[PDB]
Write a protein that binds this ligand. Sequence first.
Ligand code: HEM
Ligand code: HEM
Ligand code: 2CH
Ligand code: 2CH
Ligand code: 2CH
Ligand code: 2CH
Ligand code: CL
Ligand code: CL
Ligand code: CL
Ligand code: CL
Ligand code: CL
Ligand code: CL
Ligand code: NA
Ligand code: NA
Lengths: 480, 480, 480, 480
Amino acid sequence: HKNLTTNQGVPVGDNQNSRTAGHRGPSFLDDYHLIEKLAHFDRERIPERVVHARGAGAYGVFEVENSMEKHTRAAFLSEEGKQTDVFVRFSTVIHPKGSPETLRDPRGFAVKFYTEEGNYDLVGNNLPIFFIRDALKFPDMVHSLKPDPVTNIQDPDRYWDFMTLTPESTHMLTWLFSDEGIPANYAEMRGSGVHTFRWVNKYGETKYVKYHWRPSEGIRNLSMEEAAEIQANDFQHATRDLYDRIEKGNYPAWDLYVQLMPLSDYDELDYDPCDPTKTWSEEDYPLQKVGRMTLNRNPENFFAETEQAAFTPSALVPGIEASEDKLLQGRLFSYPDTQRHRLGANYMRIPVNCPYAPVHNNQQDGFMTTTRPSGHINYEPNRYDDQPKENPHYKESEPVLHGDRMVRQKIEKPNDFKQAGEKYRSYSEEEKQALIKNLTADLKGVNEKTKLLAICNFYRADEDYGQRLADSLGVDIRSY
Amino acid sequence: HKNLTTNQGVPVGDNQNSRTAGHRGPSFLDDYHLIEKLAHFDRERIPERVVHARGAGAYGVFEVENSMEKHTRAAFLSEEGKQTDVFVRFSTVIHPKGSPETLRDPRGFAVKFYTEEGNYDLVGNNLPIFFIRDALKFPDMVHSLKPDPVTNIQDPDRYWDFMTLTPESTHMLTWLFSDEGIPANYAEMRGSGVHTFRWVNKYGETKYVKYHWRPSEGIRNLSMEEAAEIQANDFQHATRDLYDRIEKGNYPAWDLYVQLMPLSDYDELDYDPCDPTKTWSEEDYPLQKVGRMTLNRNPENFFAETEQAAFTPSALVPGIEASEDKLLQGRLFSYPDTQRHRLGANYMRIPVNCPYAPVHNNQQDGFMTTTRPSGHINYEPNRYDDQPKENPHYKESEPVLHGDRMVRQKIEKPNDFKQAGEKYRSYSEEEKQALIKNLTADLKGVNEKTKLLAICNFYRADEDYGQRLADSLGVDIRSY
Amino acid sequence: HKNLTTNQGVPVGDNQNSRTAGHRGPSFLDDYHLIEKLAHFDRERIPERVVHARGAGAYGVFEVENSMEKHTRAAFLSEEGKQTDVFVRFSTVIHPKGSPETLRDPRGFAVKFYTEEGNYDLVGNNLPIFFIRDALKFPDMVHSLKPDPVTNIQDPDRYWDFMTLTPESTHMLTWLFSDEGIPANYAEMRGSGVHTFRWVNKYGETKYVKYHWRPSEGIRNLSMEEAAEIQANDFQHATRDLYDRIEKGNYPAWDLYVQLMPLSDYDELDYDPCDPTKTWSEEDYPLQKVGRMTLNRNPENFFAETEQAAFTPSALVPGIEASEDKLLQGRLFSYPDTQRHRLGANYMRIPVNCPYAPVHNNQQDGFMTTTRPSGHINYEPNRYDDQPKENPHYKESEPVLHGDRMVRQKIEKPNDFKQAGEKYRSYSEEEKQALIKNLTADLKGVNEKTKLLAICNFYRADEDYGQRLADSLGVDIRSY
Amino acid sequence: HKNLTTNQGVPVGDNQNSRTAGHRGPSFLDDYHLIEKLAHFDRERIPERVVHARGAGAYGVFEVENSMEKHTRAAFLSEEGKQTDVFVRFSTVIHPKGSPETLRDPRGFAVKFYTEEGNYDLVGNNLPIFFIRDALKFPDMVHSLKPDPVTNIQDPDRYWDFMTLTPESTHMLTWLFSDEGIPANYAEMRGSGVHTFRWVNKYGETKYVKYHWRPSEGIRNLSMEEAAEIQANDFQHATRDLYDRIEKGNYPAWDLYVQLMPLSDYDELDYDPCDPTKTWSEEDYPLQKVGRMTLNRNPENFFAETEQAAFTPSALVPGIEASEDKLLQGRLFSYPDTQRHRLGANYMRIPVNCPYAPVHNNQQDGFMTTTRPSGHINYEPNRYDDQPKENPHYKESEPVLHGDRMVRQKIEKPNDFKQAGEKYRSYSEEEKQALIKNLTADLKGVNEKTKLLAICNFYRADEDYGQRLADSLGVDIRSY
Ligand code: HEM
Ligand code: HEM
Ligand SMILES: Oc1ccccc1Cl
Ligand SMILES: Oc1ccccc1Cl
Ligand SMILES: Oc1ccccc1Cl
Ligand SMILES: Oc1ccccc1Cl
Ligand SMILES: [Cl-]
Ligand SMILES: [Cl-]
Ligand SMILES: [Cl-]
Ligand SMILES: [Cl-]
Ligand SMILES: [Cl-]
Ligand SMILES: [Cl-]
Ligand code: NA
Ligand code: NA
């Protein structure tokens, strides 16, 4: 048995009635419990994520099967059997908190690994590529996809205008308009690092790496009609499903695979291996098994732990570094930047975001300082041997630059259509039909000129792809 | 033709490519356009409304048919034919911003009247009563209705626990679990002030008043199964419907009626006329027509205008005052309190929130001071005749207090069950069946003890009501 | 020996050099340590207190000498020898952080008592009265005293315009323009609760109380010329003095006295005993010793503990209640209100502000939730006997109301000049000379009309007071 | 004559009394004027600048005498006689907002030019060099100089520990401990761009440039004893002096000079021309006159205009670009980053910060959106010819990179002592004496080892310099 108290720790005599002039009269200003309780209620909400606002989280463990020390000095990957705690958030992308989990969208697949050498965030999506290859375009892309800023309703004519004029998007769209555009839930779902990263071993040798997560539950998708049926009955079925699996002891898991590529392979490929609109052939760069992630614990509080969770691709650990991927480069900045605003300058002190590894540095103050700081020395260099010092054992690599000059210039070999064609051809006939059907429902009402440009882009990917789409949209393209 | 610029007004040479070390190398910190554009994108979002987060807005005009100067000095109501601009936001209640408009919930009905004597906000709902009668209980109620703080899913067992132990809620539930719990859209919908207010005429005479909005489009509701059918295909159908009506010139409208009651009738009744769990008889206190509100203009920008709109029941104008209703009394505080956090200390300067009437006072500064302030004098009293002075012509009334002590104590004659029974008996058989059906779906999974207490509460309202609900739930209540 | 780390817990390899294109080239965006470190530095600052921004804090102990249970049920006062931890902040008032401690001003004297029944804040000043008696005037008074909003320099012509037109200020000014307007430091300084409060014993009997703190070090003040001498060489001498005393083991202390007055004495006094422009006679209502407060510990971190400290007069504990004082009534609201903005919605979780008594309630969420919340139940009433419940043993008293109407109307018996005269006459000749000298230096440049009105006010207090001031200003007052 | 109103535009009937239970009773919650007025008062303050918190601003005009088109395409410099409006803020550095203007510090000298091709900020200081040459060290430096985080008092032992271990500081200190460490006021003061920048002409030819501002009022400085004497009587004398000059029509002015250096001179020098611890010889790179700035208008509102002013070295205009200076590079990021936090995401809409040039881009929303946005298109590329487009005429240069790797590594030729010695020798004997005197007063209490290292650093600058300092400190350095 416990007292209800104010935040001052004074027990509350009456949590039912305001303080009034007699039993029915107007309310008095001297009602500290009322004001305090209303004032806090009034401040419960914080800004949602600018994208991936709808989501769900869970904790678990990652266990190494095959040490990766040949290729990366990353501590968490150093030994067979090595276990690292994780927190994972899954999400949709475009619509706000509260929006349905039955909509078409990439799904987020964000994993925080609590390593001995710091927190490592792998901030992935289910699909292995992206729409654009430079961060400067991200707000444009997002704005085009988001609900129209007048009507508050998402409009195909807006995002198809942007996508058609951004033909590097063609490969991504060829995945997103398969039925994998609507995963059945978060468990029966693929995961992908998307970007090429750099793995650096104990000799300082670098390889390019890509990450893949393979669901123990298998991949399952929803047709447009299956999605609608679920939407009727539950706008939050994926969030429900994840919680319930875990609660009943049916823990979902994913195996982690990598592909590895020598840096030297750049110059021989017909695409840039750091263009995130591209995948790497699994024939030429086979999947290699690393280990397994099992999710086995729901959070105690959704707001404190899932809503306040902060991931960043720039949360890298020794042995794992960014590539030159220009999309990735922008992300390094944008996540902690947005998080400082969404969560506060001290967001890294929120329990879910805290490292297991020790934190010692000379930063200070900021809104909501709760950590009991002490000491006179908040500057380096200083004369005190016991104060925190740099540690050159932990320097990052020094990647070679091939450019002469600071430039704003697209990558060479953009090759916007080829892989999109390859992917189309890899689809079964059923999958090809679903693709075309899903594309047609999206494009049928879009401006004619934009519609034609979309057809042309998919025609450049593959002539059958393009023609089938044109037939299904009733567009005669013979004259071109 | 225009340049794309930075916020510094410098034309942008390249809005496609980040600045890099050659065409494929990593990105440079000296890229002001990239950082500025990503930084602003990163800060687009502000906190959603703590309740009523999902909603839609429109502008229109209110026109007086019958002048009300006999009963209120309110300027906007003073003359036949007098037109006043309005902004209106409609909303659901519980779920966040992106949530479906097909869920059961009261609907918000908030009207901002831009009057010559200031802005008047009539912050209503469709349904004419409320679940509780004291503001101290509002965070409890909301917390019980909101998604469970662990699962992120709304749970009938949680809100039913609260509602059953809060039997003043019995009348509201009797309305909410009719099919009016899911209005077909925002146009075909009732509006209510809910609270009793005080109207004060030029002689200082006071009457109690209640407000009612009657849709020109008629009231139409959705069954559970009709709601699901819509939800399958559109999670923002009401928002769509409102915009589209207005866009095609099919302007929705509502006629404003009041009921007026002498303060001296308090003793003539078996309920407190300022208990917002109660309605007033339309036989005894007939509806009197005031005028008509027509919505005829969509906003230019949803975020700037609808999302940032701020209403408060405390935005009262001379002649229109609060009653002693304890629920209302807390609302007077909570809305501007939450708005200062949600929108900033200067939220009253956001264009939609600005009065048409002049503003002059001695307030200053605050985040985002955009108004070009000037002058040396920011204090009153002062020696300068041309500086703003109080105007005793605009004093409010001095309501009589019947209590002689500061107390926390429930009102006399709570009478929690009677009007609920009256409302039940007023329903057609079809409506009664829908009520029972809707209640049974909601209650069938809740804790047995809580389930029985619900039945007992609705039994106290009306024995048939109760028994029918018990039968439908399979609960044998013979032993009691 | 410790590593310098990022906030992710990764050891920093180089805390000296940014990451660049060769040894002298421009900087790269992929420098997480640089961006994280700069970004936190960039966010160190929070808003300063709107008033009392300059100040210093310390911890200590309060020990009861005479138990007060006859007059108050306050737990911390219940018996002889009982010790309670305190935190105390002293301050100036008007000028910002950084401003000199040698300026004229009241000094703040804020004491936070960490009691077993919750935190009790006695938010005092050195001087025992105030300039105004209604909180509605506080922004005006402050705005008049603060630096001119055009020039950023405090202007006597401004605050004298306000004070002269606000003659209830006459008593306060008669204290503030003695040399006690500049205490020598924070240790050799009076403390005052200022307001009358209500003390309520276990039988529910109420008395009016006033609080007084008497320095073990004695009261010492600075002349204008002694202040100027110190100001030349140290703009933080009081903050220095406090810290150094405590560091040397020379702990400053204050004895707590109260005066106690029956509520029934209201009606026979010639002033309102809850007018905070009034003191009570120490002959008629003698000082009664309660105990002693010793300050013996400097904070570990000035920002975290002294800058983020939050006191409110509404932080009351059972047995100690507000009076009807209209100045106090506004303060009950304004402190937690300003704190929510200055510090965050969760400021009560900042360690210095935390109670020693348990906190359990149903509030949730808010920016920077760091407390690891858990559980499904965040609403009351609920069906769970182990969840926090109200406890009616802790109800507050039910003060009698003498008014029958909601009014805006000055108190009866304002008696603006009498006690000012009494205070003037109580001064030694030396003190009277200092008063006149200090007033003359402040008034000599102000508008002639305002200057006359000031003279007139102090003349109404005492004719010698007024004439001496007029002579010293060279103002001929014969025609009046 | 005007009414006092609420922010709702309702006239205020009584700005003197709170609303109470009779003329002497407690206060009612239903007092919207009181709560609104207090609540805004409670939110007046925003965070101060993390450095240069104390300062003063003024508007004026810059007029070109010699067009610079041969060296830079900058529009504002293109024609003889061309006038551009400016806003200028001057400041100290270390202590907070209310702190004295008599302290030792660099002074800030920040100029915002409202040009036809965007706002150009030249964010200078009076002194022409800086303590450090890499932004990664800035928070360390600042933390060492700032008041101790325990005591809130600045401590020479702290900043001397940092400076001695950071010997690149030796030149800066040799300026700052002359009497120019305390300018007499803001008018009789030097100004400096400090950094080398890049000027780019219409042919794309680049030169290195340095800026210098020469006061029409001449340079005047204060001895330690003259500073103390002013401090006694006025803690804001520079702010006062600026305002009063301008109010009287005695407008202060500065002539703008540049030095220009070919990029190819890098190899011709014994220091890095982009090392901001270095000046360029005026013999070898003579001062060339550009024009004159006159300050002639005080702001209307100190908070709205001077306090909310935002300057950034990254507010560059076509023809004026950053250099590779690593100190400057960090600044490009840190100003807008801090400003977003200090002022809000939309701080560029605060009137003083607004460009005169048109602003058109696809950014949207953010706290306090007051600009009336409209339109459906917030993304580029788009199909609409009339929407804002990039303009390749406004591309920046493509500086050549000499490094082939991403590195963290000090510049070559740091040459930490030489120019410090040159500057010492350039001092008159009087100035040398003042230098030594000022240094000795600062060093005499610091840790002996730190003290010795300081002496050694200044000895390496110049043996006389070092020996004189050692003698004056009573440190025997025979034996080194
Ligand atoms: C330039 C490209 C991109 C930018 C600028 C960007 C930006 C952002 C931002 C600002 C957030 C909000 C972060 C927060 O509030 O914590 C976010 C969330 C997220 N983004 Fe991205 N994003 C980009 C590309 C991608 C890519 C390629 C992926 C996957 C490969 C991705 C996956 C995610 C995920 C999963 C989240 C949610 C993290 C969470 O659940 O808390 N984004 N993004
Ligand atoms: C103690 C009882 C209540 C409290 C404390 C309360 C509190 C609040 C708060 C804090 C908000 C969000 C405001 C904002 O973010 O701007 C809100 C929104 C709202 N409430 Fe209530 N409320 C209560 C009862 C009611 C009642 C009785 C009605 C109708 C009679 C109602 C109708 C609304 C509406 C319509 C909105 C949304 C306004 C809009 O569209 O922007 N509420 N309430
Ligand atoms: O990116 C998306 C998401 C949903 C629908 C269509 C597209 Cl292109
Ligand atoms: O208040 C609500 C809202 C939706 C469903 C049920 C209840 Cl009680
Ligand atoms: O205890 C109960 C329960 C349900 C209906 C009637 C009664 Cl009396
Ligand atoms: O090593 C030192 C120290 C101080 C002065 C001169 C020298 Cl060479
Ligand atoms: Cl650090
Ligand atoms: Cl706030
Ligand atoms: Cl005001
Ligand atoms: Cl609570
Ligand atoms: Cl921010
Ligand atoms: Cl843009
Ligand atoms: Na009429
Ligand atoms: Na006793």
